[PDB]
Amino acid sequence: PLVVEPSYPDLVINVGEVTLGEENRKKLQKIQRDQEKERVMRAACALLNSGGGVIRMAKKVEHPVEMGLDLEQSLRELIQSSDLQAFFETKQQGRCFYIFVKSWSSGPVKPRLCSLSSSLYRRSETSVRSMDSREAFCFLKTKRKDPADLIFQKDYLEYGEILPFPESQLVEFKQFSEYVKRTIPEYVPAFANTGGGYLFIGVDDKSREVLGCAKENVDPDSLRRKIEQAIYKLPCVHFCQPQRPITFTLKIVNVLKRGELYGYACMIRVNPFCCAVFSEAPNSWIVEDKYVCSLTTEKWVGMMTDTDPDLLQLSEDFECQLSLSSGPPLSRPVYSKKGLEHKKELQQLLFSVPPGYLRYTPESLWRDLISEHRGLEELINKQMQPFFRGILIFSRSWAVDLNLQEKPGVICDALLIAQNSTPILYTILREQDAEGQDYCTRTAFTLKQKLVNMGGYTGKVCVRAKVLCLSSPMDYPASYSLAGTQHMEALLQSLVIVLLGFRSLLSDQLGCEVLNLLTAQQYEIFSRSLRKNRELFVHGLPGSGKTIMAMKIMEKIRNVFHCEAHRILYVCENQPLRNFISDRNICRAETRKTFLRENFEHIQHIVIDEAQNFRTEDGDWYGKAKSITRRAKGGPGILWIFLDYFQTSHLDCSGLPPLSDQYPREELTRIVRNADPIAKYLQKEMQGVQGTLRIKKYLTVEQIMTCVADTCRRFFDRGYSPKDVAVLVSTAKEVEHYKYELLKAMRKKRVVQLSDACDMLGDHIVLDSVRRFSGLERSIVFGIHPRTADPAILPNVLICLASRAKQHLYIFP
Ligand SMILES: Nc1ncnc2c1ncn2[C@@H]1O[C@H](COP(=O)(O)OP(=O)(O)OP(=O)(O)O)[C@@H](O)[C@H]1O
Ligand SMILES: [Mg+2]
Ligand SMILES: [Mg+2]
Ligand SMILES: [Zn+2]
């Protein structure tokens, strides 16, 4: 079997012994030549889809060689072209021979996967054949949006009778003999996938005279079960519903010699299939940990057919930084809300290319490292002399920045990008360690994999690991080194998406793991080390991202502190928000009441969100929070606090501690959520995208409900779903009357759906009290009489209403 070796900084496949050189190769018999060609083909196919790699063939001949005539054409067919140099390069090291395989790139249409054979067949006039990836993709995309019968109806035939028509796109005749097996998969998929038709078994293929083997050959009662089992064993795939099995019919007709029963003949009719049917699983491969495993039929067909999803908040305001229609196979699409920074503006702002000097980065972090640590400057300025220009990106650990546990004893990591050299990964160990090399190797491994899986880098990239200290790689070919400004900028841009990318909340509404790009401010906040920032009172406007960074930080804490995901405790005020965050299972979750009630003896890290809506009515939460966090055996765990501090009174004794004691501090100063008019109006009250703001006054409750029903009708007439709307009121006790009123007024338009905020899973309009609802959001929000029934809830409730409406806000004061 193919074996994957872990000790390398990029994916390496060793195929065992191989003999190359056409003069040397052609001597070998096929039962070995083709076997080894197929092993190498498995390797190459696997790596062209799994984000690139290196193939490592061993040999027992030491002189230089050349690609064999068979392999240099199998690679061309597999890549679907003769431009081998673009994807494969040859370099050998004596008895070891390497070919370095880029990662496939669907973008300039070319398909999204590379596979030896698609296993799909179709009838072309008189011929049957397999399909190549381009034709397979065209066919799958297309299916994503009588003389024969008068013979079939005959119940018997005589030996030697000539059938009146030849073979065609509709029919075939097959001579008989073991032959009762394997004969069906050859032709049946060909007919089903297009046109449908018949195949006659027991009839000469050329003379067309019936022969029907003989009595001793066929037992119809067994042949029927055999043929049906063979038919229904062939894998199929559907995009439609319900899943119809293979539609077919059979006749096992007695056939006579001189009028005497002499044998049997079979006529099988195959009807056009509503979807694609595969003779066998496509011969395609993708490599997982330690194993290069085949792709299943459903996985294959799904992968080849994926495309960028569309919806109201996926279009006209979201910009496609990466697409499934131009990136590698395994890349998830990425987006960035219109009006924020792209991937381009972000790397300019974070990793701008110098013209003539090797800029370090991040400047502040370099300052902290050099001041903190003795001789780091001395150790590094030596090993930066050769490289001329580029960037050197530092961090206190590149493992935790890529979702791998930070290692004890690491001083920092650094990525070295420079012109006329490959990117290089530096880790500066505090002291030499036996296991130290493993950390740098695996970190290089994962950074490389992410740079082309998550990064979406169509280009040709390699990463190398170096272990420094304060106290035999693959000689990648010459073309993998950054040859100018353009390619350096491309690689930096596809590092921007490795770092600033996070799993969007639209993954719930779409199912696919759509990634999204942070802002500069949030990245600045997120980059802070944890072991030096045990406490932090983050600020920011409402709807600016506090929840995002909160969620991210329970992953970062889990990585850094080696703690199980259940020891990190979240806290909040509203049950709906805790519901929205409880299911992620990245943490244990609570609300402030039970937070005081419960005895958290197993908690070691706390992240308090929307803190400004807390209250002392049951006791003190801040004191207990410090008591828990600071009692940890392993040292004081995080106690990050989030909150809102627009220019409005917080009040309360524990409406955040005294403002002079809120330090250290950070500021997320942008309202990404809402649209322009909502942002414009929302700013006035606190004193890039279209939307609507509608305030109506002096309307009766009857008129108000008529208007909201009419607007729901209008929006659903434009694609908005039941889950795209919300109608909110002041208090919970006011919910009951208005629920009934709305369900009534909606009768005139015969709308039916209404459910609370707790029932968030169903596609129903959500109605609840704002204080209860706070923490969530919907595309359209209706406000029914927001009023200061209890000014203990921060008096500015018109903000907690207008902050929930992404694109359309309707206010009824
Ligand atoms: N980088 C980003 N680009 C675009 N939109 C983003 C980004 N980060 C977050 N958002 C969106 O902005 C909104 C704010 O979400 P989040 O819950 O984190 O904010 P918040 O200020 O904590 O909210 P709340 O106070 O209402 O609980 C969400 O719709 C979120 O999907
Ligand atoms: Mg024929
Ligand atoms: Mg929030
Ligand atoms: Zn179907």
Residue numbers in the entry: 7 to 114, 121 to 157, 188 to 219, 225 to 518, 531 to 746, 772 to 897
Copy the relevant paper text:
Human Schlafen 11 (SLFN11) is sensitizing cells to DNA damaging agents by irreversibly blocking stalled replication forks, making it a potential predictive biomarker in chemotherapy. Furthermore, SLFN11 acts as a pattern recognition receptor for single-stranded DNA (ssDNA) and functions as an antiviral restriction factor, targeting translation in a codon-usage-dependent manner through its endoribonuclease activity. As a subgroup III Slfn family member, human SLFN11 has a tripartite domain architecture consisting of an N-terminal nuclease domain, followed by a linker domain and a C-terminal helicase domain. The N-terminal domains harbor its tRNA endoribonuclease active sites and the C-terminal helicase domains of the dimer are able to interact with ssDNA.
To understand the changes in the functional behavior of SLFN11S753D and to provide a structural basis for the regulatory role of the S753 phosphorylation, we employed cryo-EM to determine the structure of the phosphomimetic SLFN11 Ser 753 to Asp mutant bound to ATP. SLFN11S753D yielded exclusively monomeric 2D classes, which is in contrast to the predominantly dimeric state that was previously observed for SLFN11wt 26. To counteract preferred particle orientation, cryo-EM data of SLFN11S753D were recorded at a tilt angle of 25°. This resulted in a 3D reconstruction of monomeric SLFN11S753D with a global resolution of 3.72 Å, allowing model building of residues 7-897. The SLFN11S753D cryo-EM sample was prepared in the presence of ATP, which is in line with the observation of additional density in the nucleotide-binding pocket, suggesting a nucleotide bound state. ATP is coordinated by the Walker A and B motifs that are responsible for ATP binding and hydrolysis. The conserved glutamine residue of the Q-motif coordinates the adenine base. The same region adopts a vastly different conformation in SLFN11S753D, disrupting the long ID-helix, and forming a more open conformation. The conformational change of the ID-region between SLFN11wt and SLFN11S753D is accompanied by a rotation of the entire helicase domain by approximately 140°. The loss of dimer interface I, as a result of the rotated helicase domains, likely destabilizes the dimeric state, explaining why SLFN11S753D adopts a solely monomeric state in solution. In this conformation, SLFN11S753D is unable to bind ssDNA, but is proficient in ATP binding, though not in hydrolysis and has diminished tRNA cleavage activity.
